[PDB]
């Protein structure tokens, strides 16, 4: 369908024994990284238990060591039941709001408010409207399965007039609010006219009982309640963005009321996760805010990933490990992801080939594993798709070594590319702009 195959599509969960939290050598698509998966599972336990507010966990390791994959597996294993805000650090450098507001919003996104509600909605096809004046009227509605006549009040006849409700229309009436909505017209009326207006759409007739009392569970972010209270129709800003640096006194009211809802049992607070990928792209002004942001009772658990060594923090000229302030790193616990052995590469490349529905020969998978050792996991992974397509060009049944060899011949790995850049430095634009275009 519309979901194509991606880099983390094979990641289906965190792959641990739910009893002992012991990882197993592969499951749910993950391979190796056992201590990191066990640590991630220990974090996932305290996410799900939810009482521990505002912990910060850093996933640290070289490129292509499963830091993002583990973050995906944790989100899959956490399920839909808990908020999982996924934020690239680049997203915080907004032009429409300050970086602290952009962090505040991402924090607010990660706490759910859960409400369960029952409401009466009457839905059906209009059969007739009848009106008397001397105000009163009668409404006939059908489903496929019922027809009934309802007395309409004066305000209800006005609403019918304002909405231009005809026979053959499908209407819904929320009895709790009283407001009519028109869903469309019944497809039976497809022959009622020769030409139809732009805003007209056909529907199947509603089915079953006319008025239903479904029980529904609602979970909304604290960020959604903020944006809804930002302005008179702030809910539209949930989609266009188009929102200010929201006033702190609005959030102050909202937090106080959400506590009342939890005291009264109207709602359950569902604290979730914020995952900040490439957190080293934040700056000293972000990090010093995040220190205070983690102080709140309504702070999520924050996961973050970095591949930086000892490297300069942004917004300053001194270096530090991970590119992060030591004042910040003091508040963090760190999970380290290691390189992969050839046997763990051989497994991951098989999992990718299955997800990509590529039938590697055993020799191709062996050669592809050597490339993964010699040229990196992502490059050997990217040769799978390339060798499949090249095999298809020769109508081959399976990807042979010759299809991987040609894939390796056509597309350079990073190291072979850097070698090419060094070998042709005068033909390439240098860091001082010099180049020679001649032969």
């Amino acid at each position: 369908g519309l979901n194509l195959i991606a880099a983390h599509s094979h990641i289906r969960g965190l792959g641990v024994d739910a009893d002992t939290l012991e990882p197993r050598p592969s499951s749910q698509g993950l391979v190796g990284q056992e201590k990191a998966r066990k640590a991630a599972a220990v974090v996932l336990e305290m996410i799900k238990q939810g009482k521990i507010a505002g912990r910060a966990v850093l996933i640290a390791g070289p490129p292509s060591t499963g830091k993002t994959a583990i973050a995906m597996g944790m989100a899959q294993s956490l399920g839909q039941d808990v908020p999982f805000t996924t934020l690239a650090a680049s997203e915080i450098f907004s032009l429409e709001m300050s970086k602290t507001e952009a962090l505040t919003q991402a924090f607010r996104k990660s706490i759910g408010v859960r409400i369960k509600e029952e409401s009466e909605i009457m839905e059906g096809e209009v059969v007739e409207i009848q009106i008397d004046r001397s105000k009163q009227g009668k409404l006939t509605i059908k489903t496929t399965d019922m027809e009934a006549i309802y007395d309409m009040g004066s305000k209800m006849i006005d609403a019918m007039t304002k909405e231009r409700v005809m026979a053959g229309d499908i209407i819904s009436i929320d009895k709790s609010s009283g407001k009519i909505t028109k869903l469309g017209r019944s497809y039976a009326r497809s022959r009622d006219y020769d030409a139809m207006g732009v805003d007209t759409k056909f529907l199947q007739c509603p089915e079953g009982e006319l008025q239903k009392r479904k029980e529904v569970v609602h979970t909304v972010s604290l960020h959604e309640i903020d944006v809804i209270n930002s302005r008179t129709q702030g809910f539209l800003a949930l989609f266009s963005g188009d929102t200010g640096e929201i006033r702190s006194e609005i959030r102050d009211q909202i937090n106080t009321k959400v506590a009342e809802w939890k005291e009264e049992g109207k709602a359950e607070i569902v604290p979730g996760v914020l995952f900040i990928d490439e957190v080293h792209m934040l700056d000293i002004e972000c990090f010093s805010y995040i220190n205070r942001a983690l102080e709140s009772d309504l702070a999520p658990i924050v996961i973050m990933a970095s591949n930086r060594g000892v490297s300069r923090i942004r917004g300053t000229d001194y270096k530090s490990p991970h590119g992060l302030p030591l004042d910040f790193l003091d508040r963090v616990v760190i999970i380290n992801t290691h390189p992969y052995t050839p046997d763990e590469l051989r497994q991951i490349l098989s999992i990718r080939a299955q997800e990509e529905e590529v039938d590697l020969t055993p020799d191709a998978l062996a050669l592809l594993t050597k490339i993964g050792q010699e040229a990196g996991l992502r490059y050997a992974s990217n040769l799978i798709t390339t060798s499949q397509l090249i095999a298809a060009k020769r109508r081959a049944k399976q990807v042979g070594v010759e299809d991987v060899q040609r894939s390796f011949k056509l597309f350079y790995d990073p190291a072979r590319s850097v070698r090419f850049v060094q070998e042709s430095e005068k033909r390439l634009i240098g860091n001082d702009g010099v180049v020679d275009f001649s032969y």
Binding site: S172, S176, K179, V198, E224, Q253
Partner: protein, 120 residues
């Protein structure tokens, strides 16, 4: 300006002969494949779905749809008709017995239900 530009389809949004795109594109982008149409909203109204909150914002699917298609002037004219009934509730449903009552379909209008402006 020549009528070829100003009338006969050099305006991309104006449907007619020549401008064969505008008539299709208006229907599909504003109605069929438009998330704010009530049939699309109604499919997204529960659980973790993107309109879950619309039960507790005081708008109906019809008002949400209107507010997403009419411009800021037209929406402001519609505001002129409305009554600030949540501000009156702040005067009446005061007491512990009233539990600061609010209609549950307006639950998320916290700052309208609690605002000194009404009391002052």
């Amino acid at each position: 300006l020549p009528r070829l530009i100003w009338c006969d389809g050099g305006r991309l949004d104006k449907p007619g002969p020549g401008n064969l795109v505008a008539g299709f594109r208006s229907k599909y982008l504003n109605h069929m494949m438009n998330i704010w149409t009530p049939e699309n909203i109604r499919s997204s109204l529960e659980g973790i779905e993107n309109f879950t909150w619309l039960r507790f914002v005081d708008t109906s699917l019809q008002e949400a749809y209107r507010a997403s298609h009419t411009d800021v002037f037209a929406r402001a004219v519609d505001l002129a008709s409305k009554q600030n009934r949540l501000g009156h509730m702040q005067i009446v449903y005061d007491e512990p017995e009233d539990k600061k009552w609010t209609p549950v379909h307006a639950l998320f209008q916290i700052c309208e239900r609690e605002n000194p402006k009404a009391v002052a």
